[PDB]
Amino acid sequence: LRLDRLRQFIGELATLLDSRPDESTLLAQAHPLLAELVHQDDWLPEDCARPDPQRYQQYLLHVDSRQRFSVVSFVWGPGQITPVHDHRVWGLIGMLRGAEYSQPYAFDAGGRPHPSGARRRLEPGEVEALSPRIGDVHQVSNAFSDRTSISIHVYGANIGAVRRAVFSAEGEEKPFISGYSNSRLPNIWDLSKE
Ligand SMILES: [Fe+2]
Structure with missing residues (x-):
């Protein structure tokens, strides 16, 4: 299992959230974070x-x-x-x-x-x-x-x-x-x- 990819997603989402974006900016920039995660099963x-x-x-x-x-x-x-x-x-x-x-x-x-x-x-x-x-x-x-x-x-x-x-x-x-x-x-x- 590629659990490193899951760890990476969690880290990067948390990093995005650290910059305190509004919801719109959050959803927009986390969209590719998650797509990359679910691109490969x-x-x-x-x-x-x-x-x-x-x-x-x-x-x-x-x-x-x-x-x-x-x-x-x-x-x-x-x-x-x-x-x-x-x-x-x-x-x-x-x-x-x-x-x-x-x-x-x-x-x-x-x-x-x-x-x-x-x-x-x-x-x-x-x-x-x-x-x-x-x-x-x-x-x-x-x-x-x-x-x-x-x-x-x-x-x-x-x-x-x-x-x-x-x-x-x-x-x-x-x-x-x-x-x-x-x-x-x-x-x-x-x-x-x-
Ligand atoms: Fe639902």
Whole structure:
């Protein structure tokens, strides 16, 4: 495993964040950092790539000391899908293997959510951005019904601890905390094992 590439990404993102950019500058300059990471699929620990039959898995890879960001391996078993939901922090999503569909939503005056633009297909190597400022609400699904798809997510917080919400088609808001699938993180720092 090329865990040095993951270490490099974490270091460089933290370096960008050290210059205290606004969200727009951050998303713009971190976009190529993550695309470079997901351009080649040779680093993700198999532990953090494992699908589950009932639900997709969320494997935490790294959290910044000051929680300025977290890096999560998002794993879709065949045909799995999220409900419509928000994030409340900035996010960058890089596709690793397989593919996923992403449909942005927006609310009318009465609460009800509607698709607010074209559904997007994210191919391996591609990166998309989200945040409360530029659009925070979407529904995501595995683009395939016959395979496992994986995307790497970077959020502007410890996303598993962020209190957010899911929305029904009728617009019912329900409190949501995603948590994480792994009770143990991969050790990506023991260089003497490389
Ligand atoms: Fe999401």
